[PDB]
Design a protein around this ligand. Structure first.
Ligand code: GTP
Ligand code: G1I
Lengths: 269, 54, 326, 337
């Protein structure tokens, strides 16, 4: 009986993402508009699109146990969720990067970044994210070469994920490896600067540690479990089941649901 | 020390002036407001047809 | 007329295009406001920033100060002076020069603390262009660059104000530079019967620190006139204990970093005045308030890095306050 | 010597005896039968942007279409309220500006600030090159307000407890007024430009004379500094906005204070006051981020204009009484109607 009841959990979670995210988008535009708020707005928009156009489809497929639309719709759904997941993570790297000059180069921060530069970098990162998902999905260049995906690719009623090794490795790298190390290095330096500034202040006459630890831990704990198996199950010989795959993917999806709650805590907000 | 001598000369000037009761001034102000209340666009709103700002 | 509006619309474009360029320049400058009491040295510090780092009335102005300095001491030595616009004739300069050698005048110079006297009396009678006092009512400003960065330093100055109602205008400056005279603890300022000059400056600092509008402005403290402080302590003329009884029980702080060669007595007196200014700021300083004390000499310490380094820390700490780190 | 001060007490007490005798009845008792105006609501019709910093000054024009604003960024921008198009932008020699004006004929604009110097600019010139015409520099201390009698006469009020009546043609003071013991903060000319008042920081106001150049009266009903003042449209009354929460209305003929406008929930100050076309509404700025509307004959609040995000520092009403402009410290003018 828990199968029917679990559908309420998905509906309750999905409705929160759509309702929660539009609260900060409308407030920023109608009231707040600074150089560092465009990235937050872009991240919020990406999260809203991902939630609205991904979560109900996956929930319906899981509950009904039979995909209803055709092959084109399934390809579109895979392309859109890959694109949205790739673009959501990469914005945090930009946030970490630009918060670094403010602390590390206070004088040149104003001259380094402006509205035009922020718009250009946002467009560039969005194009980089989009090129990873739509182009291989539409070109059918990621198809597997085994005898298990033939039924999935030949049946319009069925739908699953059986992507080849090379595309999976490349996507996992370009979506998780690059941002993580950069953001780790950025946040390490920021802590050192605070410490000197705290040590210098003490010489003249753990909130930062707590907040950096929380910021790091929330998304690393939500995302690393999902992106750690995308290499393992392909490399291994059927050592990872599919239910755990779906569960970890949903856990990774959960992160961006409360990411805007972790962020956007300024007094003016 | 002449500052005190000059100050007392000024205060005596204001001592000898003509004054009227508060009632007369209040009546005059009320009559003026009543007379000119008609052409007060901020008080009684004008139609939007004759509004330069709308 | 259809063409009437077209020209007006084009007029807005020309004006609105200039404001875009000016916004970048305005947002990339730092404004520093000088403050203090009289005879502190606010004007002298500005002159250091002009002749050094970035960027013919001197003959008459120097003689103007010299003439008044000798007369004031000689007039009170017993215990024409006010003729308007009397020039210095060849005999006039010779006549005034001989009065210095008198031993009776010398004794009056030893007791200069009792009365009022200009500091530059000895130098001019016996860096030269800046060791002169000339006063100006209109706000005095100065523009200079250190390293590809624009700095705007101005001194409101004026005659004494006990209301200072214009202080609400300076609600956006980067920092406030405060200059005090640390070698004037036994002199009475402009009244001959009042608290000593150091206490008058302490009261002004307390009012500035506890201000409604200046609730988020840091203060840079310049304990100026360090040269005379060593001379007064070395001589046995006056002691801090007589004027400040708290000096009897004071002890040298453990965190002491004196110069290469300095007497223990001189170092203790230096830190007592600095520590007394610090207790005022820490009493009501809970975030977004800081004080940076320095031991500066206005004339013979040429380095603008002290303002440059402190300004970077102020902005660096301000960013750390945001995002909830410190 | 000492006897002069003792005699001054008798003269001071003489004034109070005469004023207390003329109080037949308070104004509130007279106007208990007047129907209240009701609830007054206004909506923003225009918003003007383009200032890089906070705003202290503002003045309309005789045509009631163009206005001029001043800011500490060093700019003096002239607007066109109907179409929202800047017509001019004059850079300034000093970055500290506290006042501005606008000539009745529209050919000149005035300015002044912490530099103790008043400046006059030319607008309608050959080849369209605005340049400084004169520089009036005789004062000691910052200026607070400037007003135009005609194209030749300008009245200033500096912070050294003095006022003056300048002369642009020769650049010299025709007459000077003294008697205040504190900084002068504001002034306002009479409708006929024969008298004017001034509110100092010693909690008092005076009624000067333009021709004779001597004081006439003195009202001392306040308890703190005074920041704003404005004449009644009739010309026989004026309202004062002080540093406390209260604003009072004085009468020239009765020589007393008539009413007091205060509320229990307001503890801020007032920076600008103004009347309406018929003298029935008394708008007043505040440090509470909003502008309140009072009633002249009832002391009843009748609306709140709270569309700003910083303190309101200037206010004005057009000559035809069609719109109200309120600047602020966030560099955003607003035209209400
Ligand atoms: N010995 C000594 N004298 C100094 C020093 N700095 C300034 N002075 C004196 O400063 C005098 C020049 O006038 P200041 O005292 O600078 O006057 P000011 O700065 O215009 O005065 P305020 O505007 O009231 O601050 C000269 O007589 C100098 O002797 C210093 O470091 N050592
Ligand atoms: C079916 N969901 C997909 C499966 C694989 C995948 C996702 C996201 C980012 C990637 O780089 C991926 O390779 C998931 O959203």
């Amino acid at each position: 009986v828990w199968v029917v009841g679990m559908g309420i959990v998905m509906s309750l979670i999905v409705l929160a993402i759509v309702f929660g995210n539009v609260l900060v988008i409308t407030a920023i535009a109608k009231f707040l508009q600074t150089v560092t708020n465009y990235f937050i707005t872009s991240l919020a928009c990406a999260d809203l699109v991902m939630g609205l156009a991904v979560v109900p489809f996956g929930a319906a497929h899981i509950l009904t146990k039979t995909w209803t639309f055709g092959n084109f719709w399934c390809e579109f759904w895979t392309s859109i969720d890959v694109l949205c997941v790739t673009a959501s993570i990469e914005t945090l790297c930009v946030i970490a990067v630009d918060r670094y000059f403010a602390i590390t180069s206070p004088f040149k921060y104003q001259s380094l970044l402006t509205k035009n530069k922020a718009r250009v970098i946002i467009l560039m990162v969005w194009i980089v994210s989009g090129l990873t998902s739509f182009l291989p999905i539409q070109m059918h260049w990621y198809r597997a070469t085994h005898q298990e995906a033939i039924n999935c690719y030949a049946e319009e009623t069925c739908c699953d994920f059986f992507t080849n090794q090379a595309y999976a490795i490349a996507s996992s790298i370009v979506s998780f490896y690059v941002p993580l190390v950069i953001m780790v290095f950025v946040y390490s330096r920021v802590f050192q600067e605070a410490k000197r500034q705290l040590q210098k202040i003490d010489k003249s006459e753990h909130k930062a540690l707590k907040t950096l630890g929380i910021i790091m831990g929330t998304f690393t704990l939500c995302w690393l479990p999902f992106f750690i198996v995308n290499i393992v199950h392909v490399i291994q010989d059927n050592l990872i089941r599919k239910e755990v795959y779906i569960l970890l993917n949903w856990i990774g999806y959960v992160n961006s649901g409360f990411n805007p709650l972790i962020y956007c805590r300024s007094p003016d907000f | 020390i002449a500052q005190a001598r000059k100050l007392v000369e000024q205060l005596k000037m204001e001592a000898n002036i003509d004054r009227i009761k508060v009632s007369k001034a209040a009546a005059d102000l009320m009559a003026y407001c009543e007379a000119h209340a008609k052409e007060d666009p901020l008080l009684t709103p004008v139609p939007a047809s004759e509004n330069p700002f709308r | 007329q259809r063409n009437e509006e077209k020209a007006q619309r084009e007029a807005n474009k020309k004006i609105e295009k200039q404001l875009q360029k000016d916004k970048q320049v305005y947002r990339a400058t730092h404004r520093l406001l000088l403050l203090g009491a009289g005879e502190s040295g606010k004007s002298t510090i500005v002159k250091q920033m002009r002749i050094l780092h970035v960027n013919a009335t001197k003959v008459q102005d120097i003689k103007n100060n010299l003439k008044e300095a000798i007369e004031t001491i000689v007039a009170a030595m017993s215990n024409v002076m006010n003729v308007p616009d009397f020039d210095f004739p060849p005999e006039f300069y010779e006549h005034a020069k001989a009065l210095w050698e008198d031993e009776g005048v010398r004794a009056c110079y030893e007791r200069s603390n009792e009365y009022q006297l200009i500091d530059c009396a000895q130098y001019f009678l016996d860096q030269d262009l800046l060791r002169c006092r000339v006063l100006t009512s209109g706000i005095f400003e100065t523009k200079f660059q250190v390293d590809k960065v624009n700095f705007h330093m101005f001194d409101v100055g004026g005659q004494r104000d006990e209301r200072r109602k214009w202080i609400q205008c300076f609600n956006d400056v980067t920092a406030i530079i405060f200059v005090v005279a640390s070698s004037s603890y036994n002199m009475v300022i402009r009244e001959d019967n009042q608290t000593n000059r150091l206490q008058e400056a302490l009261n002004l600092f307390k009012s500035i620190w506890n201000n409604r509008w200046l609730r988020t402005i840091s203060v840079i403290l310049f304990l100026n006139k360090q040269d005379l402080l060593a001379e007064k302590v070395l001589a046995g003329k006056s002691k801090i204990e007589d004027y400040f009884p708290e000096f009897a029980r004071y002890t040298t702080p453990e965190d002491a970093t004196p110069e290469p060669g300095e007497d223990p007595r001189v170092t203790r007196a230096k830190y007592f005045i600095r520590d007394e200014f610090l207790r005022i700021s820490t009493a009501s300083g809970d975030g977004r308030h800081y004080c940076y004390p320095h031991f500066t000499c206005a004339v013979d310490t040429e380095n603008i890095r002290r303002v440059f380094n402190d300004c970077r820390d102020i902005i660096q700490r301000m960013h750390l306050r945001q995002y909830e780190l410190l | 010597l000492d006897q002069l001060r003792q005699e001054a007490e008798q003269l001071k007490n003489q004034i109070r005896d005469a004023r207390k005798a003329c109080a037949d009845a308070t104004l509130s008792q007279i106007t208990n039968n007047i129907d209240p105006v009701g609830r007054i609501q206004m909506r923003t019709r225009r918003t003007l942007r383009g200032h890089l910093a906070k705003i202290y000054a503002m003045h309309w024009g005789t045509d009631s279409r163009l206005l001029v604003s001043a800011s500490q960024d060093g700019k003096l921008i002239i607007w066109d309220s109907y179409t929202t198009n800047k017509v001019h932008a004059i850079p300034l020699r000093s970055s500290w500006v506290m006042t501005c004006a606008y000539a009745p004929s529209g050919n000149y604009v005035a300015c002044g600030g912490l530099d103790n110097i008043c400046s006059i600019y030319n607008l309608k010139t050959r080849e369209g090159n605005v340049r400084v015409s004169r520089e009036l520099a005789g004062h000691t201390g910052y200026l607070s307000c400037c007003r135009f009698l005609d194209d030749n006469q300008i009245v200033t009020s500096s912070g050294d407890t003095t006022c003056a009546l300048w002369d642009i043609e020769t650049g010299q003071q025709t007459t000077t007024f003294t008697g205040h013991t504190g900084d002068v903060m504001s002034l306002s000319l009479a409708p006929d430009t024969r008298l004017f008042v001034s509110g100092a920081c010693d909690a008092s106001a005076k009624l000067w004379d333009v021709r004779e150049g001597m004081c006439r009266q003195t009202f001392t009903g306040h308890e703190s500094d005074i920041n704003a003042i404005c004449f009644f449209p009739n010309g026989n009354a004026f309202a004062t906005g002080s540093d406390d929460a209260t604003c009072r209305l004085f009468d020239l003929r009765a020589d007393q204070e008539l009413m007091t406008y205060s509320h229990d929930n307001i503890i801020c100050g007032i920076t600008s006051v103004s009347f309406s076309k018929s003298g029935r509404l008394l708008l007043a700025g505040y440090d509470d981020f909003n502008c309140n509307v009072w009633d002249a004959l009832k002391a009843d609040r009748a609306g709140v204009l709270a569309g700003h995000d910083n303190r309101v520092s200037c206010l004005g009403v057009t000559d035809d009484g069609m719109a109200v402009a309120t600047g602020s410290w966030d560099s955003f003018l607003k035209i209400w109607n």
